[PDB]
């Protein structure tokens, strides 16, 4: 709703080819306005503001015009505020207003209403529209229709549409409380000027092409439709769309409709808009943008059940043909959200095939990592059962798509977070096990001498969260094999080794507990194997106090299963390498342990 | 030594009419207790008929009065005020002229306050003005027009005018000076898209009598109502505001007359010149 948001949008989108020096000049004129007004030179302020608004009547640098509009209108609103608070200083009700301030503001109005040019008059009058409150209870209402009609004198449709944009902006900012509506109709009455020959030869003389000229309208038209349609009734919107249908090359018009109109309203007209976009022409505004806006609206609204599939079909029947991958993905990322939302794993698998096909050639994915990231985030979000998510035959190749290191590790962290936060029971499914093993391998492989400690901590948390979600039921030999394989996989990362050592010891104790002692010969061999594993692993840990503590716990766990000394010898031999309190407690624990050895 | 003297008018807008009385106050701020010999005020009303670049071109006076506001005395330090008034009336049936600013008929009504001093100071003079409105006197007279090359009588070298069929109409040429000039203009056809459309208020003044005079025409204000190639069939609007008192109701006097007209001047891409010179019977109603 606020203009500042759209101000930033237009500024960020229309930085075009100095332009920085030109904006510096605009702000210098604003500063001169402020200083001159501060020195009680009112006429200098008014004249400089006329000088500024005169720059919006010219369109020499056609591409940059919307940002010129934003900046010069900012100075124009500065003038409005200055004069308004000055008259308020001289001075509630318009009748209650003293006659002196009334005289000053009438002088202001007669000063502005004697300018030679139409566009400066319109700008410097709509700027101070607020001041009309003092003259009468109905100054704004009686002055606004005249302002809308005055635009008819502007032929160049770009300037006309942006003047309507500013007028709607001031009407919303000053007297938001129907009259503004006519603006749009008048635009329609002059819409034909957009493709009318005069504008075309103007363009061809300046050195611009229609597909680039038209994209200068979307901001102004979007603001116009947002202002008029705001809380508009269904009948008014129906009439607007009805007029937008017959109006020749309504491509850009439909784009503005889908950008401004509520997605609730655009979704239920999905079939109509699909047909209209089909009827449009590809020479001017590309159809991919229109289908992108339709997808955006669908993301917020669900069309009727009777044709949703068909919509999808038509969408991907055209979206698939898009021959510029950069153009393709920018319209497919929005559609894939609906694909996942409204259709089963087969449809999402097919669209995944399509997107891999489109982005793979010439490594075009290299440039569109952000959108691939967003689509994969959405894909993961839509799926809760990871078994299904890995049943999709084109999940792993998509992951392989991210050949870059940083992005791939980021995606691995994301999927691991999804797993840990949406998995409350350990899994034996070979598919899940394999997929998670692959992703964790590629995630770990990132660490290196330049890796940061907190990065190591977060990755360790991820891999430990995984390894904590792998269980083999009663089977303990296979469970020990899994742990030893995980050790082989996660050698470099140390906390994973710590967790795996704790886990092998806990498994040995569980094997003890699931038989109430008298470990059978097979289990005797198994327990000897696990304790040998723990012995082999411990020396690898880099820490010192942790190494000693784990040696002690390994001694306890080995003593627990009648496997009788080497661990304590190793710990004692390590002692000389070793903070005083930690060592004291370690030796106290060692002495207590030996009390039963 | 010097101090501050000023003249203040009771009405903010200074608007006054025949039969009314002008009131005000003379206010002086003084850094010292200044002894003086007198401060006087003079109200005058005149019309400074210039001569075209004679028999009956002398300036004439409508009303005149003067009052020695202050006798010899002394003005203390601080703020001091002395009211003053004047009657706005004329002998017999004569009526006051409108406060008109022009170039060959300039009607004004002024107050002059003069202060007199002595050793340690000097005499000073101050001027002022107030607005006098002519009395109220309506039937609109819309003037449909068709700006075409064949209808421009002044255009005898028409070979250079490409075909066009501008239509439209002024809502009235008998314009209430407190209401705007309103009309429509439609470009029904233009081989050469319009380069611009303007509304030029020309004042014509005559300063003399039947024996001999010079009529002089000047332009009060030019405003532009359409720029660039407007859409064909679209009703461009003609909204004009009349100057507060830079314009006066047209006057018929044995010595001088003031009259007005509006020219619709259209410019075409080949810098062509259209000129439709409508009449203007301005009045105060």
């Amino acid at each position: 709703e606020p203009w500042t948001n759209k101000r930033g949008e237009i500024l960020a989108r229309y930085t075009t080819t100095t332009q920085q020096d030109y904006v510096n000049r605009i702000e210098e004129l604003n500063q001169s306005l402020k200083d001159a007004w501060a020195s009680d030179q009112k006429v200098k302020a008014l004249k400089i503001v006329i000088q500024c608004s005169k720059l919006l009547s010219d369109t020499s640098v056609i591409q940059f015009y919307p940002s010129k509009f934003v900046l010069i209108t900012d100075i124009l609103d500065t003038f409005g505020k200055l004069v308004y608070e000055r008259i308020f200083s001289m001075c509630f009700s318009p009748e209650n207003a003293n006659d002196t301030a009334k005289e000053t503001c009438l002088n202001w109005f007669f000063k502005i209403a004697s300018i030679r040019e139409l566009i400066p008059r319109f700008y410097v009058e709509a700027s101070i529209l607020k001041c009309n409150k003092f003259l009468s209870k109905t100054g704004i209402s009686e002055c606004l229709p005249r302002l809308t009609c005055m635009i008819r004198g502007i032929g160049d449709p770009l300037v006309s549409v942006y003047a309507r944009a500013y007028l709607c902006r001031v009407g919303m900012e000053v007297a938001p409380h129907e009259t503004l509506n006519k603006n749009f109709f008048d635009f329609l009455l002059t819409f034909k000027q957009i493709h009318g020959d005069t504008v075309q030869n103007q363009l061809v003389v300046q050195g611009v092409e229609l597909p680039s000229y038209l994209p200068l309208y979307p901001p102004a038209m979007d603001w116009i439709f947002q202002c008029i349609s705001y809380h508009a009734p269904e009948a008014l919107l129906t009439e607007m769309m009805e007029r937008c249908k017959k109006l020749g090359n309504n491509a850009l018009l439909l784009n503005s409709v889908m950008s401004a109109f509520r997605a609730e309203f655009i979704a239920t007209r999905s079939m109509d808009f699909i047909g209209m976009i089909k009827e449009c022409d590809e020479s001017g505004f590309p159809k991919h943008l229109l289908f992108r806006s339709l997808g955006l609206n669908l993301a917020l609204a669900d069309p009727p059940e009777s044709d949703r599939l068909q919509i999808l079909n038509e969408a991907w029947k055209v979206i698939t043909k898009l021959k510029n991958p950069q153009d393709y993905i920018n319209c497919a990322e929005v559609w894939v959200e609906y694909t996942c939302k409204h259709f089963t794993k087969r449809e999402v698998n097919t669209v995944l095939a399509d997107v891999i096909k489109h982005m793979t050639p010439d490594r075009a994915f290299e440039d569109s990592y952000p959108q691939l990231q967003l689509i994969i985030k959405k894909v993961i979000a839509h799926f809760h059962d990871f078994s299904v998510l890995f049943s999709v035959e084109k999940f792993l190749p998509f992951l392989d798509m991210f050949q870059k290191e940083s992005v791939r590790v980021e995606v691995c962290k994301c999927i691991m977070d999804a797993f840990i936060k949406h998995q409350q029971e350990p899994t034996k499914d070979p598919v899940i096990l394999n997929a998670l093993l692959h992703v964790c391998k590629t995630m770990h492989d990132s660490v290196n001498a330049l890796t940061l400690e907190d990065e190591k901590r977060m990755l360790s948390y991820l891999i430990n969260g995984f390894i904590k979600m792998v269980s083999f039921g009663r089977d303990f030999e296979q469970q020990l094999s899994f742990y030893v394989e995980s050790r082989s996989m996660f050698c470099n990362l140390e906390p994973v080794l710590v967790q795996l050592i704790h886990s092998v010891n806990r498994l040995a104790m569980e094997t003890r507990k699931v038989m109430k002692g008298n470990h059978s010969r097979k289990t005797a061999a198994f327990v000897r194997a696990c304790v040998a594993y723990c012995f082999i692993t411990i020396p690898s840990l880099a820490g010192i106090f942790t190494r000693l503590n784990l040696y002690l716990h390994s001694g306890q766990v080995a003593l627990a299963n009648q496997c009788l000394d080497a661990f304590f010898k190793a710990a004692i031999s390590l002692v000389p390498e070793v903070s005083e309190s930690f060592l004291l407690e370690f030796l106290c624990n060692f002495f207590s342990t030996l009390l039963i050895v | 030594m010097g101090t501050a003297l000023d003249i203040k008018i009771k009405r903010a807008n200074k608007v006054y009419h025949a039969g009314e009385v002008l009131s005000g106050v003379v206010v002086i701020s003084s850094k010292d207790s200044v002894q003086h010999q007198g401060v006087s005020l003079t109200m005058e009303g005149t019309v400074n008929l210039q001569l075209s670049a004679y028999n009956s071109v002398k300036p004439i006076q409508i009303i005149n009065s003067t009052i020695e506001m202050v006798k010899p005395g002394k003005f203390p330090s601080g703020k001091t005020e002395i009211p003053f008034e004047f009657p706005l009336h004329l002998k017999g049936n004569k009526v006051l002229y409108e406060t008109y600013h022009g170039v060959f008929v300039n009607i004004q009504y002024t107050l002059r306050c003069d202060m007199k001093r002595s050793l340690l100071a000097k005499d000073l003079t101050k001027t002022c003005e107030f607005i006098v409105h002519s009395a109220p006197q309506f039937t609109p007279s819309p003037v449909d027009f068709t700006i075409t090359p064949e209808t421009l009588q002044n255009v005898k070298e028409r070979a250079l005018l490409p075909k066009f069929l501008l239509r439209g109409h002024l809502n009235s040429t008998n314009c209430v000076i407190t209401q705007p000039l309103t009309g429509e203009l439609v470009v029904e056809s233009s081989e050469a898209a319009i380069r611009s459309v303007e509304l030029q208020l020309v004042r014509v003044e005559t300063c003399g009598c039947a024996e001999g005079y010079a009529r002089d025409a000047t332009e009060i204000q030019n405003i532009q109502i359409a720029d660039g190639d407007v859409c064909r069939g679209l009703s461009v609007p003609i909204y004009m505001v009349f100057p507060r008192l830079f314009t006066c109701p047209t006057l018929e006097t044995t010595n001088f007359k003031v009259e007005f007209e509006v020219n619709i001047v259209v410019l075409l891409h080949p810098d062509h010149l259209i000129t439709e010179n409508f009449p203007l019977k301005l009045c105060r109603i």
């Binding site: 009112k42 006429v43 002088n107 | 000047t218 100057p243």
Partner: peptide, 13 residues
């Protein structure tokens, strides 16, 4: 030659 826009003074505003 004298407009209604070059004859409004700062004082009057």
């Amino acid at each position: 030659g004298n407009f209604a826009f070059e004859g409004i003074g700062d004082e009057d505003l």
